[PDB]
Amino acid sequence: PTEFEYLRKVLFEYMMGRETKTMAKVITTVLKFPDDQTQKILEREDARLMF
Amino acid sequence: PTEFEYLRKVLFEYMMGRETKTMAKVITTVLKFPDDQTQKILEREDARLMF
Amino acid sequence: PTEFEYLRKVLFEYMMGRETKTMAKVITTVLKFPDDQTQKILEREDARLMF
Amino acid sequence: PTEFEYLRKVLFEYMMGRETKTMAKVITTVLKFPDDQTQKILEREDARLMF
Amino acid sequence: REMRILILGLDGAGKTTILYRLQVGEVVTTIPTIGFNVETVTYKNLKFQVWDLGGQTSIRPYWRCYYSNTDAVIYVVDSCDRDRIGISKSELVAMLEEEELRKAILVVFANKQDMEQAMTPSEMANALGLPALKDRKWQIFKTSATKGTGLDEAMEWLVETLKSR
Amino acid sequence: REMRILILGLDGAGKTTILYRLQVGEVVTTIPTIGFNVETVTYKNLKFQVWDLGGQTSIRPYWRCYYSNTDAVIYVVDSCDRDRIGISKSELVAMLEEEELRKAILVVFANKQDMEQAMTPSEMANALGLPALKDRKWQIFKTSATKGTGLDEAMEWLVETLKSR
Amino acid sequence: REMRILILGLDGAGKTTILYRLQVGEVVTTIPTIGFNVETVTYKNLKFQVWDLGGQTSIRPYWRCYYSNTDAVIYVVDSCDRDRIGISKSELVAMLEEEELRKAILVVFANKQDMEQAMTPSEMANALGLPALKDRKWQIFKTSATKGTGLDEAMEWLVETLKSR
Amino acid sequence: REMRILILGLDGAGKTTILYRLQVGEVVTTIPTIGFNVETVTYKNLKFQVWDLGGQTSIRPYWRCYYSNTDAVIYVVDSCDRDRIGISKSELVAMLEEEELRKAILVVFANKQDMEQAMTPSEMANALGLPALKDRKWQIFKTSATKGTGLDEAMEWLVETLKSR
Numbered sequence: 001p002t003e004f005e006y007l008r009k010v011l012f013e014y015m016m017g018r019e020t021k022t023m024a025k026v027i028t029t030v031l032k033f034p035d036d037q038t039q040k041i042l043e044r045e046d047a048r049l050m051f
Numbered sequence: 052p053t054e055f056e057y058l059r060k061v062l063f064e065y066m067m068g069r070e071t072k073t074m075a076k077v078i079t080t081v082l083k084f085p086d087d088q089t090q091k092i093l094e095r096e097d098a099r100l101m102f
Numbered sequence: 103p104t105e106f107e108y109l110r111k112v113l114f115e116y117m118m119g120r121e122t123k124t125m126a127k128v129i130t131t132v133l134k135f136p137d138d139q140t141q142k143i144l145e146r147e148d149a150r151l152m153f
Numbered sequence: 154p155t156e157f158e159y160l161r162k163v164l165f166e167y168m169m170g171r172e173t174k175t176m177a178k179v180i181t182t183v184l185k186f187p188d189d190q191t192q193k194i195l196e197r198e199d200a201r202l203m204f
Numbered sequence: 205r206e207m208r209i210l211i212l213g214l215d216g217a218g219k220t221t222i223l224y225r226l227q228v229g230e231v232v233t234t235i236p237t238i239g240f241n242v243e244t245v246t247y248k249n250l251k252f253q254v255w256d257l258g259g260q261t262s263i264r265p266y267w268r269c270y271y272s273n274t275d276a277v278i279y280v281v282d283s284c285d286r287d288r289i290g291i292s293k294s295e296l297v298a299m300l301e302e303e304e305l306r307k308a309i310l311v312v313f314a315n316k317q318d319m320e321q322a323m324t325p326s327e328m329a330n331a332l333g334l335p336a337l338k339d340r341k342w343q344i345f346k347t348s349a350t351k352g353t354g355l356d357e358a359m360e361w362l363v364e365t366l367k368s369r
Numbered sequence: 370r371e372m373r374i375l376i377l378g379l380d381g382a383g384k385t386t387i388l389y390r391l392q393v394g395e396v397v398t399t400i401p402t403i404g405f406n407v408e409t410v411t412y413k414n415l416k417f418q419v420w421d422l423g424g425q426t427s428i429r430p431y432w433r434c435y436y437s438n439t440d441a442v443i444y445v446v447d448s449c450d451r452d453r454i455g456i457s458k459s460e461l462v463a464m465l466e467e468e469e470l471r472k473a474i475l476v477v478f479a480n481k482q483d484m485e486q487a488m489t490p491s492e493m494a495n496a497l498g499l500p501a502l503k504d505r506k507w508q509i510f511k512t513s514a515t516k517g518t519g520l521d522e523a524m525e526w527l528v529e530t531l532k533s534r
Numbered sequence: 535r536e537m538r539i540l541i542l543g544l545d546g547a548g549k550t551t552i553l554y555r556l557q558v559g560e561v562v563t564t565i566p567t568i569g570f571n572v573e574t575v576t577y578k579n580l581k582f583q584v585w586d587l588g589g590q591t592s593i594r595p596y597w598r599c600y601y602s603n604t605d606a607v608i609y610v611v612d613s614c615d616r617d618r619i620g621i622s623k624s625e626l627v628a629m630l631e632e633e634e635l636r637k638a639i640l641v642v643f644a645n646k647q648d649m650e651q652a653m654t655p656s657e658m659a660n661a662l663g664l665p666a667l668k669d670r671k672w673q674i675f676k677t678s679a680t681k682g683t684g685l686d687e688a689m690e691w692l693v694e695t696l697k698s699r
Numbered sequence: 700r701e702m703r704i705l706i707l708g709l710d711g712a713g714k715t716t717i718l719y720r721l722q723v724g725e726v727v728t729t730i731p732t733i734g735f736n737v738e739t740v741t742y743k744n745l746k747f748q749v750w751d752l753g754g755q756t757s758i759r760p761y762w763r764c765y766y767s768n769t770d771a772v773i774y775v776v777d778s779c780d781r782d783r784i785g786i787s788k789s790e791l792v793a794m795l796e797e798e799e800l801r802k803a804i805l806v807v808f809a810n811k812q813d814m815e816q817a818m819t820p821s822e823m824a825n826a827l828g829l830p831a832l833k834d835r836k837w838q839i840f841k842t843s844a845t846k847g848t849g850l851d852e853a854m855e856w857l858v859e860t861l862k863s864r
């Protein structure tokens with residue numbers, strides 16, 4: 001309930017293109033993504049920072 | 052429960068940057084985002100397509 | 103002739119993707135673009151800043 | 154003079170994101186850009202077609 | 205033109221099995237689809253982006269999120285599931301109300317006709333309300349994703365129907 | 370496969386008029402083309418991205434900028450313009466040397482055959498030097514963009530000639 | 535160099551009120567922070583990216599998601615809240631173990647010192663175990679977000695300590 | 700906040716020499732600017748996007764293409780050019796009428812003060828009409844891009860004037 005509002009806030013920021021790398025870590029953490037998927041997201045994200 | 056794995060699925064694809072506009076519509080529907088924000092997201096997404 | 107080199111200079115910068123919104127303004131002014139078209143280009147350029 | 158309306162017509166299309174790679178070729182030919190700069194432009198343009 | 209197709213229907217119909225049967229031999233190595241699958245399929249040297257949407261109850265409400273720019277719907281129905289054909293009708297009537305699908309053509313796959321207990325295409329068409337379809341270009345075919353029969357005939361009619369338009 | 374065709378020829382031949390005559394009824398609501406027009410045309414259910422380039426003097430030198438990936442060239446020639454047929458040849462010879470057009474096929478349209486003073490396809494053909502074409506697939510037809518005649522024939526020949534290749 | 539700071543602590547400690555008190559006058563127009571606030575602050579002509587993370591129970595588990603590249607942690611503790619000072623120690627102990635914070639400098643704010651019943655800086659330091667901290671550059675300051683006292687001093691110490699490193 | 704500054708003025712005033720003098724030592728290795736230059740500059744640890752627009756006659760009309768979102772205008776004038784001070788006034792009066800520069804502050808640089816024939820900052824201010832400026836935060840300073848004299852004082856004023864606002 002409080003985590004849902006938290007989730008939406010974080011997800012809103014990410015989708016609008018802000019501080020996307022940090023938000024990605026909280027999103028995979030809150031929704032307990034598996035290690036494989038998590039690392040796949042965190043890398044493309046890094047490959048995104050290059051710009 | 053089932054809807055949680057589903058969301059984890061739609062989200063993954065979105066973060067990896069695949070079929071983002073469609074994924075944004077299901078992500079905003081599943082989490083019941085408020086119209087104003089849903090629209091903000093679905094416009095940047097439309098502008099995104101111009102590339 | 104000074105204006106040509108000028109135009110060529112501003113065109114190069116624009117096509118290499120740097121400061122595209124400003125270059126767009128001087129390009130349409132130098133070549134005297136009709137109002138309709140100029141406004142068309144300046145909008146896409148604005149929609150382009152979102153990213 | 155006839156080439157000026159021409160250039161404007163072509164530049165408009167390019168700046169509006171339509172058939173950019175062909176437009177790039179005619180713009181650089183009409184304004185007689187130097188080989189180096191023309192090649193720098195037509196490559197960035199190519200790296201764009203991958204999307 | 206590169207058309208886009210959606211495969212829809214209730215859980216257990218054989219939607220996923222059909223997808224891979226198309227543009228690939230066939231290996232029903234399959235598990236309930238809690239999400240979706242998308243593959244590019246080539247028929248008569250043509251190209252389509254085909255979506256296979258999971259059909260269990262809790263996620264059926266999200267099908268409409270995918271209706272934009274749809275050329276055709278391949279509606280799969282289990283020919284031996286007599287208890288649930290009424291439900292497949294409700295979902296069908298509900299999606300044909302959708303403004304984004306107004307021009308999409310509909311093709312029904314009465315799947316699992318390899319089983320003795322399967323209903324006839326006619327029984328199915330009537331129970332789905334197809335005879336009363338207005339402003340719609342439709343047709344129903346019998347199929348067996350497992351045995352690989354009938355799909356070719358169905359795709360033929362589909363491709364030709366939209367090549368016209 | 371989606372082919373792209375370039376409509377070329379001197380100023381005032383009927384290039385623009387012919388483009389819209391294809392894939393549309395006809396309304397010669399036309400002005401000189403100081404730039405170009407691009408339209409999607411469908412023939413025998415096939416699809417083409419057709420480019421119509423303006424032909425007055427000063428802009429003709431930029432024709433070669435569009436030759437990349439060209440499948441065929443519809444070359445329009447004014448049948449009554451006896452004074453400038455020699456120039457049309459100069460242009461045609463120049464583009465045929467172009468390395469990017471090597472595999473493109475040539476279709477010549479002897480346009481304005483509805484004018485009592487139009488020369489004959491045989492006269493035009495010899496003047497353009499078509500009887501001497503080597504390693505080239507070509508044919509000449511007589512048309513009238515205004516009356517809408519001879520166009521269907523030309524397209525039939527073009528579509529089939531490339532359907533082979 | 536532009537440092538980035540984290541303002542951590544339990545719900546109620548006064549973290550948000552502090553953030554806006556810095557780089558801006560002050561207006562504790564405040565509501566429970568369900569998420570986070572980020573603002574850029576300039577002290578002695580320098581630049582800090584300051585993150586204010588909500589501290590209620592359910593979201594405290596996600597603090598570590600932000601530890602990456604942290605230069606300093608301003609840890610806010612409610613000086614009047616004696617019943618929960620042990621929980622503050624717990625969270626504090628846990629975060630310091632974090633490998634990504636090893637080189638971060640710690641600054642504790644014994645906030646709400648404008649209140650008569652607020653415990654002293656010495657009691658808190660001992661109660662939080664600060665005296666035992668090894669390999670840790672730290673300091674404790676008594677502050678008041680509403681009255682705005684003790685902040686300039688703390689900022690001075692933080693700015694100078696890290697300018698060293 | 701990162702401010703953007705425009706360096707305007709007639710050809711030969713020393714605009715380009717000033718740009719590089721700011722944020723680097725000094726090497727007037729310069730040629731007439733037929734276009735523009737842009738560079739990121741840091742003063743009192745602050746960030747500025749600074750543009751240098753070429754000033755010969757035929758391209759002066761395009762300065763206004765760059766007026767949007769301008770925080771300050773450093774107007775550079777040749778202190779030894781007595782024949783053209785009136786033209787420097789025309790241009791200045793014209794640009795100050797621009798609605799997009801309403802909230803921009805003005806800083807005139809009486810450049811080339813290393814030359815004996817350099818007019819005083821007071822004569823310049825009078826010939827340009829600065830004293831008559833209403834609703835304009837402005838100041839004038841004498842400088843020497845080559846000798847690097849006068850720039851620090853100028854920048855201090857600018858930096859502090861805008862920190863206010």
Ligand SMILES: Nc1nc2c(ncn2[C@@H]2O[C@H](COP(=O)(O)OP(=O)(O)NP(=O)(O)O)[C@@H](O)[C@H]2O)c(=O)[nH]1
Nearest residue numbers: 215216217218219220221237258259316348349350
């Ligand atoms: N006898 C028979 N079984 C079939 C046929 N097509 C699919 N099946 C079986 O039906 C079951 C489910 O098929 P599947 O394609 O996964 O169904 P689905 O519609 O994708 N289910 P969901 O929507 O839950 O993802 C499998 O055991 C499969 O082998 C058919 O034509 N005949």
Ligand SMILES: Nc1nc2c(ncn2[C@@H]2O[C@H](COP(=O)(O)OP(=O)(O)NP(=O)(O)O)[C@@H](O)[C@H]2O)c(=O)[nH]1
Nearest residue numbers: 381382383384385386401402423424481513514515
């Ligand atoms: N009698 C006749 N007139 C025609 C025919 N096709 C075009 N015309 C006329 O010839 C004129 C020029 O035609 P148009 O299509 O604009 O020529 P174009 O080659 O596009 N010219 P440009 O290269 O300058 O744009 C128009 O006035 C048109 O009506 C035809 O088949 N018969």
Ligand SMILES: Nc1nc2c(ncn2[C@@H]2O[C@H](COP(=O)(O)OP(=O)(O)NP(=O)(O)O)[C@@H](O)[C@H]2O)c(=O)[nH]1
Nearest residue numbers: 545546547548549550551567588589646678679680
């Ligand atoms: N007397 C006093 N009250 C203070 C002080 N600092 C904060 N408060 C009060 O404490 C309450 C909560 O403050 P706030 O800044 O929202 O706390 P927080 O730590 O950000 N809470 P959260 O983490 O939930 O967002 C407010 O009513 C505020 O006015 C202080 O120094 N003195």
Ligand SMILES: Nc1nc2c(ncn2[C@@H]2O[C@H](COP(=O)(O)OP(=O)(O)NP(=O)(O)O)[C@@H](O)[C@H]2O)c(=O)[nH]1
Nearest residue numbers: 710711712713714715716731732753754811843844
């Ligand atoms: N004595 C002296 N010469 C200077 C000074 N500032 C610039 N100059 C000289 O004046 C000349 C022109 O300077 P420059 O910076 O290129 O001028 P500009 O305003 O950018 N010209 P443009 O607008 O045409 O590009 C150079 O030869 C330079 O060395 C100064 O303060 N004193």
Ligand SMILES: [Mg+2]
Nearest residue numbers: 220235236237
């Ligand atoms: Mg399945």
Ligand SMILES: [Mg+2]
Nearest residue numbers: 385400401402
């Ligand atoms: Mg025309």
Ligand SMILES: [Mg+2]
Nearest residue numbers: 550565566567
């Ligand atoms: Mg708060």
Ligand SMILES: [Mg+2]
Nearest residue numbers: 715730731732
């Ligand atoms: Mg210069």
